Structure formats: structure tokens, C-alpha cells
Symmetry: C3
Subunit: 295 residues, 3 copies
Amino acid sequence: ELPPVASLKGKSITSAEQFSRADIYALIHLASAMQRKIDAGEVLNLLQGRIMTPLFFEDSSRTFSSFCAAMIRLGGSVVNFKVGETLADTIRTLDSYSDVLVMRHPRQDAIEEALSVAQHPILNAGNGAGEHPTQALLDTLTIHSELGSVDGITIALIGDLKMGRTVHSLLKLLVRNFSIKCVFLVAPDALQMPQDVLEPLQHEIATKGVIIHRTHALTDEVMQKSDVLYTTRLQDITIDAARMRLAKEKMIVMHPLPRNDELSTTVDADPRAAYFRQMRYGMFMRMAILWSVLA
Amino acid sequence: SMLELPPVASLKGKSITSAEQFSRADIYALIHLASAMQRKIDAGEVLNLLQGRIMTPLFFEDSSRTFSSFCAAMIRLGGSVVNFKVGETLADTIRTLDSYSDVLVMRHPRQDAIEEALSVAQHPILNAGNGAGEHPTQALLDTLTIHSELGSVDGITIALIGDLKMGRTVHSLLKLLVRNFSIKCVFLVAPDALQMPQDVLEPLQHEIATKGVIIHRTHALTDEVMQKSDVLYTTRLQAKADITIDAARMRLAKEKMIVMHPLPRNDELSTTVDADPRAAYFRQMRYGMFMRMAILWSVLA
Amino acid sequence: SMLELPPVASLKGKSITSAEQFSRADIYALIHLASAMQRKIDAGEVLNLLQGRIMTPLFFEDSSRTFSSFCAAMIRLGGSVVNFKVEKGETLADTIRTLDSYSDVLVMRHPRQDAIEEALSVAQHPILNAGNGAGEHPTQALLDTLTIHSELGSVDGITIALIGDLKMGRTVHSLLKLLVRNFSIKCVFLVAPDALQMPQDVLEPLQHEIATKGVIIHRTHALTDEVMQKSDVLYTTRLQDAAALQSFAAKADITIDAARMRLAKEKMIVMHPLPRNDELSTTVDADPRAAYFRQMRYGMFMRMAILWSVLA
């Protein structure tokens, strides 16, 4: 079966904060059941005659495609709305004809604006520097499916943690819902994990017990102890073939993409390079989210 | 369901280019077909009617709402859509589309582009806006709106407000209403430079005469116009012409009336009016998907 | 409908990159499969053969016309399309890997001739080459062969002229390779200004097969009465500022119009991959031997036949 996760039915998907551990577990397992079927040649007509509409004020072919492909693989349909008309006027236009909106916008508070006037679910595909929860959830699914489990892991977050909307959402989702041992906040000092992200996290950091061992650049303590390396762009941070020596045998590298120098192509064929497999997990997590919300 | 949703027969095979081609019988037949489809789609049903047919948009002009309304119609009837983004002539572009398609939705800035396309197309064309000419589907959904909000089209007093000279919406709505309905009065609210052209109004003189329809121009949105009108149908001006509709002017209006707009909108339609139960212009978009569902199915059945 | 629409088994899982990869039997397989498709679609019937399967574009040129012919074939097979726009300097290889994550087949068009060989090297899914610089347009060559076969009854025994910018024409590079290697062409006329003649690196690799089958090859720079009165197929292309593209006399010499068509035989066809400029007069359009618009319908059925066979 592919029963939907009941608690998302009709819900908007704005923040990682809204997802309980039972929620995550269920989506992780719906996504896998789905992968099992798609990989087996099965066709899913779960969402026929239902329409998703992207509302991408900023371009991103990968995020766009992944949502589309996911909707299509559930039998659903896609109608692009290329984007001065006010945001609300657009939101009401999409509500005319679609069942679910998917919005990517450069201002953080554009999301809260839209939800005030929206009659159908809005899925947040990302907003300025705040969040990007379907990424956080797809990243967790990657880890669950690559390493066996997410409980007890050590995780490194490389790159500018200030602007990177993937690292915030992930940091919240993981700490709040799992038993994370350590978290290497690796970046330049100026471009680090903001105070407002780290502050609401402080209850769980204590009672679970969670080492936030920061670092200016990629130390060997990181490479040695990390089960997951989650690097990002910024446009002694590079992960290359040389440095990968120091990694354990059961670990993975991740990157949401796109990339620059900070992750060498010299790592691509390494079986612990999970950054490409991560995108396919993405399609499957979004199929699980789309079915759950629109069921 | 060929049972519960029977297409309009006059439309089968036909290109849809002007208001002039629709009879009054056709209009109510479309309106009833639209409503039957709204009940079926709102019940959560999946219509399978145009499985394997392809709709191909051909927009030589930016218009996301029109495109998406049309794509949404087609899809909810079970049809498919092929995106074509606009040296190479118009005819050749048409003959190309024609090689894999079941219906074309064209939207061009030049007025005569439609005659050019029709001259060569083998599959039906629906005109989604041809220069300063017409927008026949818009006028058909606007009429569905009037009917579904007010319960009758005969006897209304209507204000066409804004750029009347270049508004392909208002050209089509005026033609559609005057020709096939007993319109009491029509306020032509606009500056003299943006007035309703005489070659839209000439062909109607005879029908205007017979049905006894008052044709009244004002350069500004007066209080007579607000108090008498059952539909205020407003449009943009793409410095100081006084035609704006806010919540204050809405104190002058009747209780049973609607405000309408094809969209997008500028300063002529304040967001103060939105909450008002007589603000129809958001419901107008939804009605439009169902009329377009009605039309597409009728064209292609 | 798998005894109704049998896929060409030799093509299963393959990327389609070059015309040289096809045998005579393959081509006839695809023609017969494409005709069965026209029978299905023209009967008003619907197909589910690629339900659930996704095609995406990896287009670095822009040619909506071509991505649309492909979309249309995929959609009529019951399949689906996810668009993907390319604009950054993110690597070609990463673009491929990102498409691979959710697609079942890629349709590639790149202006560099040898970006296809890069994609193949990293792709885990079949790539359909929809044009590579001055290289090949293989699907195009296959639908052109289907056209000729449908309209004249057979391909062996034809005289055919290839007109226009042959140096850069990729449609003609592939059509020439396909025709000469698998059919007994009576004669190819290469009609083009000297600077834009069919390249030597295309012709030299076909010399054994020419010599052996006795194909006659005549260059000209003009549509001489010989060409018009002997050709069963007039395959012209478009010119893309160097001396020959600039010359009015180069244009007038290769142009087909109502006038020149008076010299042509009762039973032949005029073909063009589209789009066209002035080299093919709109005065030829009414002529029943103008097969360039029908060419587009054959093309849909030939892409259906190719995709069904790659993805079955």
C-alpha cells in the first residue's frame, strides 16, 4: 500500500518545524514503498485530474523538475505559471484552477503573505534565506536509506550557513526529531549559522545533548568523526579525493546542488558520494508529500 | 460522461474567433454545460473526455493567466498540452503546430493574424486575443459570471469602464450581449481618446434600435453610473481620468450587483473592494475554466 | 497492444546518436512500426504504452519546434514531459546527472558537435540526439526516409538532390549516410555553393559503399535542368555572413519556386526539414509534390516508433 500520511491531508508545507518524528518516519517509508513500485515498472494513478502549479519567482530547474516529475509519476498534472502584479492577485489566480501551489520566492515573508490568501495547499520550495523543508525531508530520507538510520549520527554542515536555506531547515528537522550526537558547523566566521536559527533549538540541544562544535574550516576531527558530510556552495573547505582518505567506510557526502569548487569532481565515482542519488530520493519524497497533502 | 455532459453540436469542428458567431441558444447551452461540469469537478470527479487529444498554445504575447486557464480546462477534460514558445512566418508556425495537434489557442498582437492563421489551419483555432480585436472566450465566461451571480442577463444595466478603444474584452462583451440579449442600458465610461469605436458600434445600431437599448457615454465614473448599474465591468488603462472603484464609491451601488474585471488590474480597482460579497472578479476566473472546459469539449467532441 | 505495436527490439535501451547505427532491417522495422502508429492514432484510438514514463529536454540551442515534435510523440504514446531549461556555467555532466534522476529518456540538442559524446559517457538513460553542431540529426534522417518511402513507394532506385548549406546541414549529413549505406540510390546531386559543399569527412567514409553500389555523385552550385528533370526527391535546406550566405546569386541558384517546378517530373517530391527562408518559395505550397508539411506528420509517427522501441 501507499496509504497517505493522514496528518498532512490538506496542509500547507512551510517549515521543517511542523514535522513530528512520526510524520518523518511515515514520509520516509511512503517514499520508499513508492520507489519500490516505480523501480518495478508500476504506474501510479493516485492524483489523476489534479493540477500542480509552480510559482517560481526565482529560477531553479532542478527544484522545478523534481516537483513536476513527482506530480507526473503520481498520475497528476502540471500547469506552469511564468512570472508588476501583486503576489495575492497571483495566488488567487492559481487558486482558480489548481489543487496545489509550489512557490519559490526570494523574499522570506512572501510565503506568509501567500498563505494568508491561499485556498489550496502551498508547498514551500524555498524563500530568500529562511527555509526549504522538502529538501530537509529529502536529505533525511537519503541518510535513512544510505546509512541505515538517522539516530545517533554525527553531521557536518559546510559552506555559508547564513544564506543557505537548506542547512537551516535540516538543522531544525534533525535536532528537534532525532538523537544527533554532534554537529560540525564548518564555515567562515562571518558566514555562519545565524543566532535566530540556533536560539529556538537550545531546549533540544540540552535535554538530548548535542555538541555544536564549530570550526573555521575542514578539520581532520570532522573528516574522521562525521557519518554525514553535508556541503553547500559559497557563491580548506573543499572535499576532494585526497581528503576522502580520512573519511570512515560507512559514511556519505551530500550536496543539494548546484556546486562549485567546494566539492571536487574527483569524488564523483566514490560510492560514498550520495549527492546524485540524493536527487532521486528527492523525487520520491515529493511524491510522498504530494500524495499525502492531496489525498 | 457522454450521458450527463452532452457537447454543444453547433460548435463541433468549428474555430472560435468572434462574438458574432454565437447564437443565444448556444450561449445558454454553453452556460448549462459549464455548470454541469462545475458540479462534476467540485464533487471530485475525473472527466476522461479528451484523452489522447492535444491542445497547443501559440502565444506571440505574454499572458500567463489565459494560457493557464486554457491549459487547466484541457487537462481537467483529460486532454494533453504541448508548450510551444514563440524569419519563420506565422503560417509556417501554424502548419507546424497543425502536424501534431487537435486544437490551437492563438494570441497575437496584430488584429489580422487570426485571418492569416485561419487561412491555413486544418485543426480548429480558438482566439485568445487578437490585437485590438476580440476575446470571444472571455466574453462567454463573463456572461456565465453575470448569469450565475445575478440569475438573468436580460434587463441589466452594464457599465464598460476603462480603455474601451483597445479593450478586446469589451469589444467582445458588447457584441455578445447586445446581439443576443435584451440589454436595458450600457454606460460607456472612458475618456474621449479611449472611447468605444464606431465600427464596433455601427454593426450593432440595428439591434440597438430594435431592442431599445440606451447607449450612454461618460468621461468619468459618475454617480448615475454607479447607482443604475447591475454590472460594473472594469479594465485598466495599460494622467488624471477619474474612473476608480473603491469601497467608498461602493456605498453608491445597489445591493444586487457585481463588479467584474478580466485581469490584471491597476489603480482603477482598489483592494478595498475585494472583501465585498459583490466582488465577482475572483470567481470570474473559476467560471472561466468551466466555460473553457465547456467550449473545448464542444469544439472537439 | 504488443502484437499490435511491436517495438523494434534491436533498438531497446539504445541511445540514438548517429544514422550509421541503423541497418536496412532496423529502418524497415521502424517504418512498419510507424505506419501501425498512424493506423492507431488516425483511428481515434488512444495509447498507454509509455504511461508513467518521462521525457525531458537538454536543449542548449533553442528550437521549440523540435522539442514540440518530440513532446507530441511522447504524449501520444501515453508518456509524459517535464521541461528543463538550461541557462551559471553548471557543468554539462551535472545537468545530465540531474536529468537522469527523474527521467526515462533525454532529448539533447547542443551546438558543440562533441558534447553528445560527453553525455553518453555519463548518462544511465538513452539519449536521443536532436542535433549536435554540424554533426548529425538522426531521427530527422529516419522520418525523411519514411516520407520518401510513403510518397514514392520505394527508396532503392531514387535520384535525390541535397540542396543548400551542406557544410553545416546536419539533417543532410545524416540523410546521406543513411541512404547510401542501406539503399541502392541511383544518384545523389550535391547542390550548393562551393564553400558550402558536402564535407569530405562525410563523403570519404562512404566511398566504398558508393563505388560498390554504383552511386553517381554530381556536385553543382545550381538547380540545373538536369537536376530538376532527373530528381525524384528535392531535399533543400536553409542558409545560416561569409561570402556565400551573403550572395544573392547563390540564393537564386538553389531556390525552388513555381517557375523551376515546371521542369520537374510528374512523380517526385519536394522536401525540407523546416524552418525555411526564401530558398523555398511559398508559391510551391499548392503543388501536390510539396511534401514538406506532410513530412512533419510522418515525423511524429516516426518519433513515436523510435521512442516506443527505445523505451519498451
